[PDB]
Design a binder for this molecule. Structure first.
Ligand SMILES: CCCCCCCC/C=C\CCCCCCCC(=O)OC[C@H](COP(=O)(O)OCC[N+](C)(C)C)OC(=O)CCCCCCC/C=C\CCCCCCCC
Ligand SMILES: CCCCCCCC/C=C\CCCCCCCC(=O)OC[C@H](COP(=O)(O)OCC[N+](C)(C)C)OC(=O)CCCCCCC/C=C\CCCCCCCC
Ligand SMILES: CCCCCCCC/C=C\CCCCCCCC(=O)OC[C@H](COP(=O)(O)OCC[N+](C)(C)C)OC(=O)CCCCCCC/C=C\CCCCCCCC
Ligand SMILES: CCCCCCCC/C=C\CCCCCCCC(=O)OC[C@H](COP(=O)(O)OCC[N+](C)(C)C)OC(=O)CCCCCCC/C=C\CCCCCCCC
Ligand SMILES: CCCCCCCC/C=C\CCCCCCCC(=O)OC[C@H](COP(=O)(O)OCC[N+](C)(C)C)OC(=O)CCCCCCC/C=C\CCCCCCCC
Ligand SMILES: CCCCCCCC/C=C\CCCCCCCC(=O)OC[C@H](COP(=O)(O)OCC[N+](C)(C)C)OC(=O)CCCCCCC/C=C\CCCCCCCC
Ligand SMILES: CCCCCCCC/C=C\CCCCCCCC(=O)OC[C@H](COP(=O)(O)OCC[N+](C)(C)C)OC(=O)CCCCCCC/C=C\CCCCCCCC
Ligand SMILES: CCCCCCCC/C=C\CCCCCCCC(=O)OC[C@H](COP(=O)(O)OCC[N+](C)(C)C)OC(=O)CCCCCCC/C=C\CCCCCCCC
Ligand SMILES: CC(C)CCC[C@@H](C)[C@H]1CC[C@H]2[C@@H]3CC=C4C[C@@H](OC(=O)CCC(=O)O)CC[C@]4(C)[C@H]3CC[C@]12C
Ligand SMILES: CC(C)CCC[C@@H](C)[C@H]1CC[C@H]2[C@@H]3CC=C4C[C@@H](OC(=O)CCC(=O)O)CC[C@]4(C)[C@H]3CC[C@]12C
Ligand SMILES: CC(C)CCC[C@@H](C)[C@H]1CC[C@H]2[C@@H]3CC=C4C[C@@H](OC(=O)CCC(=O)O)CC[C@]4(C)[C@H]3CC[C@]12C
Ligand SMILES: CC(C)CCC[C@@H](C)[C@H]1CC[C@H]2[C@@H]3CC=C4C[C@@H](OC(=O)CCC(=O)O)CC[C@]4(C)[C@H]3CC[C@]12C
Ligand SMILES: Cc1cccc([C@H]2CC[C@@H](N3CCN(c4cccnc4)CC3)CC2)c1
Ligand SMILES: Cc1cccc([C@H]2CC[C@@H](N3CCN(c4cccnc4)CC3)CC2)c1
Ligand SMILES: [Ca+2]
Lengths: 607, 607
């Protein structure tokens, strides 16, 4: 049905086996799979021999000879069938893959001289589903023959395809040209030799975003695609045509970076925004490169940190006047005589409803109307981001804060009863948002990362085995003290409280049930000595030793993930703040003869 | 008696020394141990010189000359005694070891030309107890001369034995042929050169399980024996005759694995069952090999995980209706006036006996008859495995659960008194079996391994030194507060409770005895300050630091032991479930011209 996404991997495994069956049960496809050239001359000099018959993938006999790189057998199929060269595969898995595609992928042939001598099409599009990029195809070579030749590092075949008229600007279904595909190849060193070779054959008089400024179907150039895909090797090589040394002075050079596709120019997505909003771990190592790590720590020292410690001082002072309008909330004494289950009730205030007739209730009225306005402004700069940027932690904890302030407003107006419940969330979803502003400080910055990596990490996998233990012993502790007097040692008197006592006894944050005047059940002393060992001794200290084994093997990741929080903050502070504040980064080159671009120089010793 | 298993190692140490005594006190055995050929001609040209006399191991003089590789002295014993070649050793330690065996083991001789020129037997069986495989013999070479020659890596001697008629199919007492013995040799690289050489001399027209399909006396072929013995090097080499590349496409090949001795064909034990049910740590590295790690994670993603989260949702829902039939158990109030030792008794319910006359006792009756049926079905699919597979943790914890449910059933029928005791075990042996189903999840999967490795690990060796301390201080705390008023600070009022208070004070899961109104004994403040240091401070934190030193040096073992739990689960889910469910793994080759075997292809980049 829908649960089988492995029913297409199953459908192509039994399609490759059916390919090898059709080769064996047909005489010339087996004669092309082997050489068998003395037997291959005989099979084609017949009356109605089918040279145009297909296999399971739609192979002709020239496809089989080019796939098993039989040079001598493939010459015979082109002599006695010159029309066979122009014929592609027709199966849905391999659509349009001509015989020129197959002889190119094998990184060699003397057949690509012979196929192009028979005027084979260099603009054939291998549009089949085995050539799309996916996490189920081991290759993404493109669609075109020079896209296949440039990804196998064949500099003799790429030059020989272009001399026969291969279009240098051919794009895929994804929009990727030849120069995009080289970036997302697994062999990053050999793609740098090929990136230079494919640009040498541009020389295109109609320049018009010449060859490495043309984007794919999601608006990424080759330079920005190396940023998203995490290609560090093709990022330093792509940066070489953007820097230029002003002067060298002994050991001291002074380059000048172009910075026109890294910094936020206009409404276009800059390369600092693509690295943050991508889902790769290796993409955030471009934040350590020499035009980027000196661009981020130049608009964070100057402009990013003063505009982040002003928003961290307004918010920390906004929430002291939210705390004090919950400490001083209106609260009368009780009227209903406590005719409740007596001695199991001690609530004695039951807050006011329309009583504000006090000059201390008017000072609070100003101070609790600031926190209403301050929680509407959160829902006017955060909700127009969630429902304007698709659907995809401190975002969630500040809509939730701003929702709980509006819930306790509606409960204040309609005089609803339980108002301690939205305030208790808003006093702790609110104060724990001051941990957001512990990323402008390098000391207490990564300490907020390794709280996220442990809540949704080491403590989320400990959660599901702790709850196994504290449901087994809490249900064992309950039925032991069920035939009991709860007046003394009443830790487990009803089944919710036995769960919460046993959770507390797991963490040793209450004492441990003992009376010493009255004989406890005999079964209690055994099942609590078992709960003491396998839960307090064993399993609690197993969790503080898998948080101390977490650190030293995430100590590099957690410390390089601080300046990825600086980029995400500097990008956010730049988009929200207007252009009257926040001057642009770098030195504009209108008054220096360098164009309309914004440059960033840096000097360094090179020894 | 029986306690001396080192009385046979003692019996062969004094048997090798007695061998060296008999050589010295006899003239020609010392003349054969050295060369002494001018003295060796003289000793044999006598009237009644004993050339057929024995040593302590039953050596003839040709054995001594072949053991100390004296080529020139051994020629003289064969000229003047050609009958001496055919004579084996007769001691129980070295039975049947002819002189051809000894000249072969030394990895060289020109004597093996000379012994075979005297038509020495190539089918001599060295059946002595120093040649059986054991953890007290450093060698297991086999029984036959070409079994001795192939295990010393002598390709000149193996070819020269076969040309004189050495049987290629000779088997041991263990059933091992020549090709089995090469697998369980300590030098794994040189056995791959020999495995190919011994198959080249097969060419056997009577094929009939040709040479590497013949099993030993426990049903293992050479391919399955490399799985059990942990031979990773002879597993990849043995797999080369099972894969075959369908096609190579540039960097992209497509092999097709045979999978007929790895997957469960029928009632025969497949190789995935042999790796799990063996006692070697190095055998479970064959689970990471390219036809096996892609077979396991193909019938776990498809069929193993849906049939394991259905059994983990039935069991977790079976035991919520066992918990609720213990929360709501029938329980009257007390009748016997508490004429017990008054104020030391608070049990006040003493559960019902035949009172079910309630419409809430009938809903429980359905819910506690499900847990009776659900605990019989456990004892019908687990007891027919224990008493049907020899005699050899979550097996034990679910027979014990299913036994405690049947004990609390018998106590319910006969109206037995103490029923809180089988329920208290069954509520915690039952809930802690939900940790079994935390192996279908890779996050909380290895977290169940390092609970087993710490209960029967770091906490089992801490158990025997903690109980030394909490018997010494509990017996010191008892006699201090023995001359005391137990009405106030009654932690230690009788000797069982002093043990349980001191166990709790060890773990700091009760407070710590203090009264502050009445003067405690002076001796208490000294012996509790000693118990605070050497038990709470020193020895408790010694145990949480040897669980945190456990992790980072078992972090690789504990994480590769997760997918050994997946294999053991996938094997168990395949044996229990019928063939109507659970389709077989791989693609059958009846409709593709490949035979009756079940193949598994995989494609990969090879750069
Ligand atoms: C993450 C960001 C969270 C939200 C931040 C505020 C929301 C975005 C800004 C407000 C939107 C309305 C707007 O477009 O804002 C226009 C005003 C500029 O006009 P003005 O006369 O108020 O400032 C004159 C002061 N001068 C001369 C020095 C420029 O910008 C302002 O000041 C408003 C910003 C003042 C706060 C700065 C940081 C503390
Ligand atoms: C109404 C409020 C309006 C503004 C009130 C003044 C508050 C601060 C605003 C302006 C000052 C910020 C500033 O201009 O400088 C930022 C300073 C650090 O300045 P620095 O360059 O010397 O850093 C050291 C540089 N290094 C590392 C290279 C040596 O930051 C600081 O201390 C300021 C810290 C105040 C912000 C509190 C945020 C709450 C954090 C909670 C953590 C949990
Ligand atoms: C971003 C901009 C947003 C915020 C801008 C401000 C907006 C305008 C101002 C809002 C303030 C609203 C606060 C709501 C609380 C109302 C207080 C109230 O309604 O009554 C004041 C209480 C009365 O005392 P009482 O009721 O006990 O009667 C005593 C009985 N008799 C007189 C017999 C002795 O006065 C007291 O208690 C003294 C209070 C003690 C705590 C005050 C100190 C503040 C705490 C921390 C500051 C730290 C700064 C950052 C670091
Ligand atoms: C994220 C990982 C953690 C997952 C949650 C772990 C904690 C479980 C959730 C607890 C929330 C409690 C909600 C509080 C209010 C509802 C009360 C309640 O809870 O109902 C109470 C009932 C009745 O109690 P009673 O003493 O008043 O009547 C005694 C009758 N007389 C006196 C005749 C003996 O008792 C009963 O719940 C009977 C049912 C007992 C079995 C409940 C099992 C919990 C469900 C799923 C566990 C999942 C674990 C996965 C691993
Ligand atoms: C570890 C394994 C622990 C024990 C597992 C169950 C014991 C072994 C199976 C029961 C033995 C009796 C038997 O031989 O079982 C025969 C039935 C097949 O006949 P059927 O008409 O009941 O199923 C028709 C449904 N159809 C058409 C979709 C196949 O297999 C079944 O369904 C019974 C199995 C149903 C549970 C599947 C996993 C949840
Ligand atoms: C009467 C009950 C009959 C069945 C009721 C429905 C419950 C589940 C049965 C069918 C759903 C199982 C399924 O079809 O899928 C298994 C899912 C995960 O599916 P996935 O492929 O997306 O995994 C992610 C794949 N990856 C890692 C490559 C990205 O497992 C899950 O969450 C399901 C978890 C439910 C089982 C609870 C077992 C108790 C565990 C206690 C731990 C202590
Ligand atoms: C694989 C298949 C195996 C199992 C399949 C099901 C088999 C058929 C069903 C079996 C159910 C057995 C349950 C035995 C317990 C009987 C309960 C009982 O006999 O009485 C029901 C109680 C009565 O209340 P009361 O005695 O306090 O009198 C109140 C006094 N008046 C009325 C004055 C207010 O009703 C209550 O308390 C409400 C109960 C609260 C807890 C129920 C919710 C369940 C808990 C967790 C579910 C989570 C799912 C997994 C995640
Ligand atoms: C796996 C590692 C842990 C090994 C076990 C560690 C804990 C030991 C086992 C404890 C189980 C206790 C069983 C509870 C019921 C039996 C009661 C009992 O236990 O008998 C109580 C007797 C009498 O007590 P009373 O206060 O009523 O009379 C006082 C007389 N008046 C008043 C005249 C002064 O007291 C006596 O046991 C006198 C005997 C004292 C010496 C017992 C030594 C324990 C045996 C072996 C230790 C192995 C350590 C290996 C390292
Ligand atoms: C009536 C007066 C006092 C107005 C008071 C309002 C301010 C105290 C509020 C309104 C909008 C708030 C801002 C709304 C948006 C954000 C971004 C938010 O960051 C995120 O979205 C989280 C990023 C992540 O960690 O993933 C952190 C708080 C902050 C700066 C808020 C800081 C506090 C602000 C300025
Ligand atoms: C690692 C964590 C996420 C997993 C384990 C969580 C549980 C151990 C905790 C979380 C919330 C706790 C519950 C929160 C609410 C209640 C209700 C509470 O009831 C009352 O306080 C009644 C008083 C009244 O209503 O007046 C009793 C404890 C109990 C069941 C708690 C029992 C223990 C719980 C389930
Ligand atoms: C690491 C562990 C495995 C080694 C140490 C275990 C002991 C410290 C524990 C395990 C079981 C405990 C015992 C379990 C049962 C009892 C009976 C108990 O007696 C009662 O509760 C009497 C009440 C009644 O019978 O009504 C007193 C504590 C005692 C001796 C406990 C003392 C401490 C013991 C020996
Ligand atoms: C009346 C109705 C509700 C029937 C309910 C019965 C089921 C809830 C029980 C009966 C048989 C049980 C199974 C019996 C065998 C096993 C294998 C057992 O695994 C082992 O043997 C442990 C392996 C190891 O860790 O060494 C784990 C539980 C499981 C799946 C059990 C899961 C729960 C089952 C299906
Ligand atoms: C993940 C794992 C693997 C293997 C073994 C475990 C332990 C989990 C339960 C544990 N019992 C739990 C409770 N018992 C108990 C209960 C009441 C009275 N007296 C004794 C003692 C031991 C025994 C084994 C866990
Ligand atoms: C494994 C090991 C090696 C070497 C030494 C030890 C310590 C174990 C007992 C320890 N005493 C135990 C109790 N004493 C004591 C007791 C009562 C009142 N006042 C004092 C103090 C010290 C002293 C040495 C352990
Ligand atoms: Ca305490």
């Amino acid at each position: 049905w829908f649960q089988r996404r492995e029913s297409w991997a199953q459908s192509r495994d039994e399609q490759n086996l059916l390919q090898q069956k059709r080769i064996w049960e047909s005489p010339l496809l087996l004669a092309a799979k082997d050489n068998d050239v003395q037997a291959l001359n005989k099979l084609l000099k017949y009356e109605d021999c089918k040279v145009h018959q297909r296999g399971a993938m739609g192979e002709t006999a020239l496809h089989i000879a080019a796939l098993y790189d039989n040079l001598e057998a493939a010459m015979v199929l082109m002599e006695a069938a010159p029309e066979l060269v122009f014929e592609p595969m027709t199966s849905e898995l391999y659509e349009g893959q001509t015989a020129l595609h197959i002889a190119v992928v094998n990184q060699n042939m003397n057949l690509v001289r012979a196929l192009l001598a028979r005027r084979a099409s260099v603009s054939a599009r291998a549009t089949g589903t085995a050539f799309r990029r996916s996490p189920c195809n081991l290759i993404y070579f493109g669609e075109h023959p020079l896209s296949f030749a440039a990804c196998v590092n064949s500099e003799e075949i790429v030059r020989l395809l272009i001399e026969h008229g291969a279009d240098i600007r051919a794009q895929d279904s994804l929009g990727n040209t030849v120069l995009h595909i080289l970036i997302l190849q697994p062999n990053k060193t050999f793609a740098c030799q090929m990136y230079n070779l494919l640009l040498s054959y541009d020389r295109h008089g109609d320049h018009l975003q010449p060859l490495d400024l043309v984007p794919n179907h999601q608006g990424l150039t080759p330079f920005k695609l190396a940023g998203v895909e995490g290609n560090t090797v093709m990022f330093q090589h792509l940066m070489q045509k953007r820097k230029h040394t002003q002067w060298t002075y002994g050991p001291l050079t002074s380059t000048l970076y172009d910075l026109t596709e890294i910094d936020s120019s206009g409404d276009e997505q800059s390369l600092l925004e693509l690295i943050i909003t991508t889902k790769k771990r290796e993409a955030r190592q471009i934040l350590d490169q020499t035009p980027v790590k000196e661009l981020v720590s130049l608009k964070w020292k100057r402009y990013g940190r003063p505009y982040f410690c002003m928003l961290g001082a307004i918010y920390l002072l906004y929430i002291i006047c939210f705390t004090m309008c919950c400490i001083y909330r209106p609260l009368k004494p009780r009227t209903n005589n406590r005719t409740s289950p007596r001695d199991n009730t001690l609530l004695q205030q039951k807050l006011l409803q329309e009583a504000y007739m006090t000059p201390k209730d008017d000072i609070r009225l100003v101070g609790e109307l600031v926190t209403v306005i301050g929680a509407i402004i959160i829902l006017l700069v955060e909700v127009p981001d969630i429902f304007r940027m698709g659907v995809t932690p401190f975002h969630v904890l500040i809509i939730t804060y701003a929702f709980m302030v509006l819930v306790t407003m509606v409960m204040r107006l309609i005089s609803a009863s339980g108002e301690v419940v939205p305030m208790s969330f808003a006093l702790v979803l609110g104060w724990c948002n001051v941990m957001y502003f512990a990323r402008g400080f390098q000391m207490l910055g990564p300490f907020t990362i390794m709280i996220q990596k442990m809540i949704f990490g080491d403590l989320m996998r400990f959660c599901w085995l702790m709850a196994v233990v504290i449901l087994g012993f809490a249900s064992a502790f309950y039925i032991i003290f069920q035939t009991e007097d709860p007046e003394e040692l009443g830790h487990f008197y009803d089944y919710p409280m036995a769960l919460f006592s046993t959770f507390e006894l797991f963490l040793t944050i209450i004492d441990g049930p003992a009376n010493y005047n009255v004989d406890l059940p005999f079964m209690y002393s055994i099942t609590y000595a078992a709960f003491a060992i396998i839960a307090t001794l064993l399993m609690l200290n197993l969790l503080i030793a898998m948080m101390g084994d977490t650190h030293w093997r995430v100590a590099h990741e957690r410390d390089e993930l601080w300046r990825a929080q600086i980029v995400a903050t500097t990008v956010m502070l730049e988009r929200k703040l207007p252009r009257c504040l926040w001057p642009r980064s770098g030195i504009c080159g209108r008054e220096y003869g360098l164009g309309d671009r914004w440059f960033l120089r840096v000097e360094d010793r090179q020894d």
